[PDB]
RNA sequence: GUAAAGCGCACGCAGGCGGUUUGUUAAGUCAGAUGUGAAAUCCCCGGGCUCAACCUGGGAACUGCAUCUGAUACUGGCAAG
RNA sequence: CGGCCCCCUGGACGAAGACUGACGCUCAGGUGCGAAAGCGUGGGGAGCAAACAGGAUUAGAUACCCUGGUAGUCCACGCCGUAAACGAUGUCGACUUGGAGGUUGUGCCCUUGAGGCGUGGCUUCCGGAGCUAACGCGUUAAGUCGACCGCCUGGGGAGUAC
């Protein structure tokens, strides 16, 4: 009766009638145990439930606070350690061991929906090991790509790299003072080197521009069977905006751009002329 | 937030005689004007902007906040401050256990609001006369008592008081509690039991009512946000 | 999980103009065979529902001990109104050496091993009392190497 | 900083303690208290009765300025002594006036005299004074039409006790209290004062320089013993008293208020 | 204080205690050593009676006393403040 | 210890300075002072009044009440050495939040007024922490400590017997 007499905070029920019901629970601090109450004398009510409308795997988890503490109860009952977070959908990536996955996991089609909906938005269950192994899939990156924001030396940017956590990718935003107890800061010049980094994030919207920001290709031409958007961009670039457009250029005039072949253009033009003939046709 | 010139004008640096005070107040007074106590406002300031703050964060988890103040001067302005951030009050005589004999107040509620639903929502009309006085009687007595704390459900996570000593039971209903308290303390008033003092002229009603502006501002934010 | 020792119970009674009216009082305390622990002393017209009432207080109010592994972690006095308590830490295997109310606040606690004596009254209710008091003021080695701003190395 | 101390002692510097400085503002009306706020500790309980003029209206809306008194602080929650009582000190500036150029002119009508002196009343107070005053010669203002309209010219102050005594008609003419405790003493002199505390045996009315007088519950009216002196008169008003009797050794002025 | 228990009040010998700084001494105090503190008994580790009690080897202990050699914070003595 | 005066005389407190330089605290035995009653010798003797007498009251009234009334009370010099001789609280020192007074100094302040701001001594009441069986005590401790002494160990028998 407590829960009925606003003494168990319960939230949502992200439970599945007929398999597991597992719901996590607040409550006002004052020596009340809102599992405790929902389990009773062994699991004296928590018998009722489990027997209730059919044998259902009912489980109470201790809400801690906000949502962080929510991802390890929608996890139990069972081992979970850590979690990662993101924006809007934020997909709480479950981090276990394989020995307590098996437990964890329960079932591929059970608790891996059961504890998708505790959250209310969805959990992606991996190991220990696999957190590493995409931790790390991720420092490369913000240097894993081509090294396409600052760029100087390699020498002197691979020595900047070993000690430069998140490579710099978008690291101005951060303290821009602790590069300079790095052994070598004179001037501010690596202060400038991440001002070079921002610099190519506008490059990079300036190659952004190069695929939009100078009008990129429309929609019949970019969704023309047989070219990607790199060849889209590459016909475009020769004042064509449209299919219709693709198709009134010739092998000769597509010619001019070496990432076309004339085989190629042969072959695009071709099939612009055949869906602006046969546009009547579905 | 709120400035020191604006407390000045309101009246918050005067504080009770001097045969009156409390020595446990010694820090947060300033000194002794015309045989008059005169708090600190340097000290008073941070510690009212810390509260504040303290009390949006409250409100920010979604807190039920209690705006305490039976001076009978004021008792218009908590209520009015109470609704402007649609929170809860009692501007009219504690009752005696209110907080930790909730569970029988709650019946009293109960009651409060079985009556009211009787007076607007059956129309019935037809009762005998004396009969009929006598359930108004009941319900004005419940309304003054009770009508803030009628849509509170359980106990508030927050206490607001505008005197101390005067409301000594409430506060101690709250550390018994374990609510947090956030209590204007004059010169004469005990703090101890308080856990967020705010040294400030309780008795003065301009005083009275910046305090609870800026109470019910931060409130309103801790809701917004 | 919790356990639950009614100490005492005590029949008193009050003279009215017929009479004696007889009622009971309670004397119990509890614990979760951890530093938590808590007494309850309740009063009725029947014993049954003044032991509720005891069990009931005591639920609440509890109050939390710093328990080196199963004894104390120094010797202790604790005193209250008439009953004034020693008890001290003892090693595994001793047992509770505790006479009365004593003992089972000692009992519930998940104190193990202790030698105790109590001076003076032996009122159970002021004994446990000033047992509860013995244990709330004992403080750990931690407690007082962050008291004093040290490691606990340096307190050993 | 310093900012504070710098302020407190200009806040100082901005008030002083008696009714001189008007600062308070009335900041709220109901029948029947008016309250002000000075920059005091706390706001004045004010009666009403010092804030209507001469005909028993009330003068003055929100935000109006009137200073009030000082130099008693908490009786267990408020603060002030009444207002009126500043006006005083107004009349007596006036008073003052005359001594610069020995003529203070107003109007004063006198019809009667209280205690052998014609009483004289300026705009709202009315003051008692000594018989030569209300006339500079023998005239005798009893066959002048009833509540003549001259000016008051000052014939006589004690300078102490509040009893001043002023000259209406003839424009053309122009320890300490113990000893001689004979001026008011014949058998019947009535003065104007002001009572001070009811006693539940008594009312207190003293005004003639540093002394006491209990007009005490026996004669106050004309009914003896179911009187309760709070119901009867006031509390703070100024009346018809006069002597009966006087102790000049045990200090005790027997007044009373039958007559 | 009211349960038993503050001399009716003082002065004051003996006695007990004694502000603060420096120097000195080393009586108290502490440290180490030597001598002794019988054996048995007690306690520890062992051994022998089938076990045990009992017997029994070695240790520890016997908290002390006396001396010698140091330490000098405290207490004391002496000298100056 | 209480009407004024005078003579001889002890202590206390404050104000500044100056000096001495631990000379101090406590105290078993010891010594002194010690209400009232009481004793001795000699004086005195108004009033009051143990004892006593009478009148009442009463069942009785060796009392209470009334009318009288002697020791004594008063003085001098001795003795007695006890009292709920009580704050039922040993003395000395140090430290710990406050308020309202009284009394007696004293410094400054325009005493511009009986006042304003301090700073000492003694003292009455209330009350905080703490203490206390509780009652209460509470900077004059019954709080927190030190030094010395006195005293207690169930009630009666008994503060009696020898």
Same mark, same amino acid.
């Given at each position: 009766?407590?829960?009925?007499?606003?003494?168990?905070?319960?939230?949502?029920?992200?439970? @599945? =009638?007929?398999?597991?019901?597992?719901?996590?629970?607040?409550?006002?601090?004052?020596?009340?145990?809102?599992?405790?109450?929902?389990?009773?004398?062994?699991?004296?009510?928590?018998?009722?439930?489990?027997?209730?409308?059919?044998?259902?795997?009912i489980d109470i988890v201790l809400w801690d606070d906000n =949502?962080?503490?929510?991802?390890?109860?929608?996890?139990?009952?069972?081992?979970?350690?850590?979690?990662?977070?993101?924006?809007?959908?934020?997909?709480?990536?479950i981090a276990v061991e394989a020995g307590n996955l098996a437990?964890?996991?329960?079932?591929?089609?059970?608790?891996?929906? +059961?504890?998708?909906?505790?959250?209310?938005?969805?959990?992606? !269950?991996?190991?220990?090991?696999?957190?590493?192994?995409?931790?790390?899939?991720?420092?490369?990156?913000?240097?894993?790509?081509?090294?396409?924001?600052?760029?100087?030396?390699?020498?002197?940017?691979?020595?900047?790299?070993?000690?430069?956590?998140?490579?710099?990718?978008?690291?101005?935003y951060v303290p821009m003072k602790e590069l300079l107890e790095?052994?070598?800061?004179?001037?501010?010049?690596?202060?400038?080197?991440?001002?070079?980094?921002?610099?190519?994030?506008?490059?990079?919207?300036?190659?952004?521009?190069?695929?939009?920001?100078?009008?990129?290709?429309?929609?019949?031409?970019?969704? +023309?069977?047989?070219? @990607?958007?790199?060849?889209?961009?590459?016909?475009?670039?020769?004042?064509?905006?449209?299919?219709?457009?693709?198709?009134?250029?010739?092998?000769?005039?597509?010619?001019?751009?070496?990432?076309?072949?004339?085989?190629?253009?042969?072959?695009?033009?071709?099939?612009?002329?055949?869906?602006?003939?046969?546009?009547?046709?579905? | 937030?709120?400035?020191?010139?604006?407390?000045?004008?309101?009246?918050?640096?005067?504080?009770?005689?001097?045969?009156?005070?409390?020595?446990?107040?010694?820090?947060?007074?300033?000194?002794?004007?015309?045989?008059?106590?005169?708090?600190?406002?340097?000290?008073?300031?941070?510690?009212?902007?810390?509260?504040?703050?303290?009390?949006?964060?409250?409100?920010?988890?979604?807190?039920?906040?209690?705006?305490?103040?039976?001076? $009978?001067?004021?008792?218009?302005?908590?209520?009015?401050?109470?609704? &402007?951030?649609?929170?809860?009050?009692?501007?009219?005589?504690?009752?005696?256990?209110?907080?930790?004999?909730?569970?029988? !107040?709650?019946?009293?509620?109960?009651?409060?609001?079985?009556?009211?639903?009787?007076?607007?929502?059956?129309?019935?009309?037809?009762?005998?006369?004396?009969?009929?006085?006598?359930?108004?009687?009941?319900?004005?007595?419940?309304?003054?008592?009770?009508?803030?704390?009628?849509?509170?459900?359980?106990?508030?996570?927050?206490?607001?008081?505008?005197?101390? %000593?005067?409301?000594?039971?409430?506060?101690?209903?709250?550390?018994?509690?374990?609510?947090?308290?956030?209590?204007?303390?004059?010169?004469?008033?005990?703090?101890?039991?308080?856990?967020?003092?705010?040294?400030?002229? %309780?008795?003065?009603?301009?005083?009275?009512?910046?305090?609870?502006?800026?109470?019910?501002?931060?409130?309103?934010?801790?809701?917004?946000? | 999980?919790?356990?639950?020792?009614?100490?005492?119970?005590?029949?008193?009674?009050?003279?009215?103009?017929?009479?004696?009216?007889?009622?009971?009082?309670?004397?119990?305390?509890?614990?979760?065979?951890?530093?938590?622990?808590?007494?309850?002393?309740?009063?009725?017209?029947?014993?049954?529902?003044?032991?509720?009432?005891?069990?009931?207080?005591?639920?609440?109010?509890?109050?939390?001990?710093?328990?080196?592994?199963?004894?104390?972690?120094? =010797?202790?006095?604790?005193?209250?109104?008439?009953?004034?308590?020693?008890?001290?830490?003892?090693?595994?295997?001793?047992?509770?050496?505790?006479?009365?109310?004593?003992?089972?606040?000692?009992?519930?606690?998940?104190?193990?091993?202790?030698?105790?004596?109590?001076?003076? &009254?032996?009122?159970?209710?002021?004994?446990?009392?000033?047992?509860?008091?013995?244990?709330?003021?004992?403080?750990?080695?931690?407690?007082?190497?962050?008291?004093?701003?040290?490691? !606990?190395?340096?307190?050993? | 900083? &310093?900012?504070?101390?710098?302020?407190?002692?200009?806040?100082?510097?901005?008030?002083? $303690? =008696?009714? &001189?400085?008007?600062?308070?503002? !009335?900041?709220?009306?109901?029948?029947?208290?008016?309250?002000?706020?000075?920059?005091?500790?706390?706001?004045?309980?004010?009666?009403?009765?010092?804030?209507?003029?001469?005909?028993?209206? +009330?003068?003055?809306?929100?935000? @109006?300025?009137?200073?009030?008194?000082?130099?008693?602080?908490?009786?267990?929650?408020?603060?002030?002594?009444?207002?009126?009582?500043?006006?005083?000190?107004?009349?007596?500036?006036?008073?003052?006036?005359?001594?610069?150029?020995?003529?203070?002119?107003?109007?004063?009508?006198?019809?009667?005299?209280?205690?052998?002196?014609?009483?004289?009343?300026?705009?709202?107070?009315?003051?008692?004074?000594?018989?030569?005053?209300?006339?500079?010669?023998?005239?005798?203002?009893?066959?002048?039409?009833?509540?003549?309209?001259?000016?008051?010219?000052?014939?006589?102050?004690?300078?102490?006790?509040?009893?001043?005594?002023?000259?209406?008609?003839?424009?053309?003419?122009?320890?300490?209290?113990?000893?001689?405790?004979?001026?008011?003493?014949?058998?019947?002199?009535?003065?104007?004062?002001?009572?001070?505390?009811?006693?539940?045996?008594?009312?207190?009315?003293?005004?003639?320089?540093?002394?006491?007088? +209990?007009?005490?519950?026996?004669?106050?009216?004309?009914?003896?013993?179911?009187?309760?002196?709070?119901?009867?008169?006031?509390?703070?008003?100024?009346?018809?008293?006069?002597?009966?009797?006087? %102790?000049?050794?045990? $200090?005790?002025?027997?007044?009373?208020?039958?007559?």
């Amino acid at each position: 009766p407590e829960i009925g007499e606003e003494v168990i905070e319960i939230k949502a029920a992200a439970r @599945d =009638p007929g398999s597991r019901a597992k719901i996590a629970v607040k409550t006002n601090d004052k020596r009340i145990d809102p599992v405790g109450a929902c389990v009773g004398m062994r699991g004296a009510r928590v018998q009722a439930v489990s027997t209730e409308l059919g044998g259902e795997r009912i489980d109470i988890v201790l809400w801690d606070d906000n =949502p962080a503490q929510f991802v390890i109860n929608a996890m139990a009952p069972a081992d979970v350690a850590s979690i990662v977070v993101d924006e809007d959908k934020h997909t709480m990536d479950i981090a276990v061991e394989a020995g307590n996955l098996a437990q964890a996991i329960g079932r591929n089609g059970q608790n891996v929906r +059961l504890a998708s909906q505790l959250s209310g938005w969805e959990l992606n !269950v991996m190991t220990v090991d696999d957190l590493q192994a995409k931790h790390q899939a991720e420092a490369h990156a913000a240097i894993d790509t081509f090294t396409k924001y600052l760029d100087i030396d390699e020498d002197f940017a691979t020595v900047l790299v070993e000690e430069g956590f998140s490579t710099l990718e978008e690291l101005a935003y951060v303290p821009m003072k602790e590069l300079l107890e790095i052994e070598g800061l004179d001037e501010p010049t690596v202060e400038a080197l991440r001002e070079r980094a921002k610099n190519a994030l506008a490059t990079i919207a300036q190659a952004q521009e190069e695929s939009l920001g100078d009008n990129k290709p429309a929609d019949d031409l970019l969704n +023309l069977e047989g070219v @990607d958007r790199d060849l889209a961009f590459k016909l475009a670039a020769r004042g064509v905006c449209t299919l219709e457009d693709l198709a009134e250029q010739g092998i000769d005039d597509l010619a001019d751009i070496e990432g076309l072949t004339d085989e190629k253009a042969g072959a695009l033009i071709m099939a612009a002329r055949n869906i602006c003939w046969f546009g009547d046709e579905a | 937030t709120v400035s020191m010139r604006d407390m000045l004008k309101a009246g918050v640096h005067f504080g009770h005689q001097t045969r009156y005070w409390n020595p446990k107040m010694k820090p947060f007074i300033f000194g002794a004007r015309n045989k008059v106590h005169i708090i600190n406002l340097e000290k008073t300031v941070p510690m009212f902007n810390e509260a504040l703050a303290e009390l949006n964060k409250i409100a920010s988890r979604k807190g039920k906040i209690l705006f305490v103040g039976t001076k $009978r001067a004021a008792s218009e302005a908590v209520k009015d401050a109470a609704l &402007s951030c649609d929170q809860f009050f009692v501007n009219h005589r504690w009752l005696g256990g209110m907080l930790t004999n909730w569970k029988t !107040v709650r019946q009293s509620i109960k009651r409060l609001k079985d009556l009211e639903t009787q007076s607007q929502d059956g129309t019935f009309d037809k009762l005998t006369k004396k009969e009929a006085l006598m359930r108004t009687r009941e319900l004005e007595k419940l309304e003054n008592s009770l009508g803030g704390i009628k849509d509170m459900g359980g106990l508030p996570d927050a206490l607001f008081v505008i005197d101390a %000593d005067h409301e000594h039971i409430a506060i101690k209903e709250a550390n018994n509690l374990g609510i947090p308290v956030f209590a204007i303390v004059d010169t004469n008033s005990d703090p101890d039991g308080v856990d967020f003092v705010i040294p400030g002229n %309780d008795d003065a009603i301009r005083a009275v009512t910046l305090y609870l502006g800026a109470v019910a501002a931060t409130v309103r934010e801790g809701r917004s946000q | 999980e919790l356990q639950e020792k009614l100490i005492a119970v005590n029949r008193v009674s009050k003279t009215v103009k017929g009479g004696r009216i007889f009622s009971f009082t309670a004397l119990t305390v509890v614990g979760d065979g951890n530093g938590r622990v808590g007494f309850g002393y309740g009063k009725a017209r029947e014993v049954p529902a003044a032991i509720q009432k005891a069990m009931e207080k005591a639920r609440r109010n509890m109050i939390n001990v710093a328990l080196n592994n199963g004894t104390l972690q120094h =010797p202790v006095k604790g005193v209250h109104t008439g009953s004034r308590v020693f008890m001290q830490p003892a090693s595994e295997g001793t047992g509770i050496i505790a006479g009365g109310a004593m003992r089972a606040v000692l009992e519930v606690a998940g104190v193990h091993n202790v030698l105790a004596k109590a001076y003076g &009254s032996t009122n159970p209710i002021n004994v446990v009392r000033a047992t509860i008091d013995g244990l709330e003021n004992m403080n750990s080695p931690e407690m007082v190497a962050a008291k004093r701003g040290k490691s !606990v190395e340096e307190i050993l | 900083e &310093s900012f504070a101390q710098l302020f407190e002692e200009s806040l100082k510097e901005i008030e002083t $303690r =008696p009714g &001189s400085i008007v600062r308070g503002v !009335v900041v709220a009306i109901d029948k029947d208290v008016v309250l002000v706020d000075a920059g005091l500790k706390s706001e004045s309980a004010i009666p009403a009765e010092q804030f209507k003029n001469a005909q028993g209206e +009330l003068e003055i809306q929100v935000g @109006d300025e009137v200073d009030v008194a000082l130099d008693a602080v908490e009786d267990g929650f408020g603060e002030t002594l009444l207002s009126r009582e500043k006006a005083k000190r107004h009349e007596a500036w006036i008073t003052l006036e005359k001594a610069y150029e020995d003529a203070e002119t107003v109007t004063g009508v006198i019809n009667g005299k209280v205690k052998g002196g014609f009483t004289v009343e300026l705009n709202g107070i009315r003051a008692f004074l000594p018989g030569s005053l209300v006339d500079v010669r023998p005239v005798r203002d009893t066959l002048h039409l009833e509540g003549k309209e001259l000016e008051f010219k000052v014939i006589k102050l004690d300078q102490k006790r509040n009893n001043v005594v002023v000259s209406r008609r003839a424009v053309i003419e122009s320890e300490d209290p113990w000893v001689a405790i004979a001026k008011r003493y014949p058998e019947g002199t009535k003065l104007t004062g002001r009572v001070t505390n009811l006693t539940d045996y008594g009312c207190f009315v003293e005004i003639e320089e540093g002394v006491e007088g +209990l007009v005490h519950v026996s004669e106050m009216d004309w009914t003896n013993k179911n009187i309760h002196p709070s119901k009867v008169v006031n509390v703070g008003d100024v009346v018809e008293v006069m002597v009966l009797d006087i %102790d000049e050794e045990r $200090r005790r002025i027997s007044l009373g208020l039958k007559q």
